[PDB]
Amino acid sequence: SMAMKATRLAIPDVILFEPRVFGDDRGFFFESYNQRAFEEACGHPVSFVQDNHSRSARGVLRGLHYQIRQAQGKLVRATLGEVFDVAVDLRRGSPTFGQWVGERLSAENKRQMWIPAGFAHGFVVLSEYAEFLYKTTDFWAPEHERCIVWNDPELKIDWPLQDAPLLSEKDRQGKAFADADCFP
Template identity: 50%
Template structure:
């Protein structure tokens, strides 16, 4: 695995070594030794999976109570995955990184606690899997509206074509959101 830091300190892009032949392909999606050597989490409390259709936007989600680190990947199809620094004390507060993850490129993104997370489905359908470091706590869940102009995320979808849940459409703005210290 190639593990490299993104423009946001702590957010890591993980690119597996893909072994391909005439039968298909194989790669590791998690390796205890590789993660441990990079100081990344090696204990997961929950695995999650979703299937979404093209133009679905999920997020920007985070938990103030029971904050979660997330290891995310597309199992099939492609998504634009976004991490937003929500640590008020960070010099990168309010900045984001966006990476295309797909079933073909096998790339994963490690998003530590203190960051918001969202993704947009780029293909007709996409499967999305993620491991988390803490349990889901609905009382601690927060949402920032996906198209907050202060975040200036260049989503490659016309806003009228984005498929967004009521919760995500009515999220707080960065300016009004409860964020991390």
């Protein structure tokens, strides 16, 4: 069925993609996205309207973000460095509501995650510096972004970390999972 690997995770709708590479470390070529494979993989059509690119230093943790209005699916990867990327299922009635999955994505391993509408998203940087890019199905609007605090006790996420995250004020002020409005 492919020519990039696709693997459903503990939470099935969340998918990990692995591009096939051609060439080697001194020259290589790879497909970072293929509408056909991606749609066959996720089982439905998708339109990406915005691409976002960011750079953040070791230990920066941007996180537990999601928009309830102007909801968005996100396809994320690391073109530089290594992050641990996390997805939380906040879908009304989901059998896996309140569950999370996480994976290391890096420029070396070239892995990506699709995180559908209805999930909260986050990552922490593990390398000296990380460059993160994602494609979304709708635009990032601050007036609509909610947040769940990274270190929430019930989610009890396994941050491969071992040093306090450098968080933004906003993310520090994150809501407790218990108090979090979730997705219809």
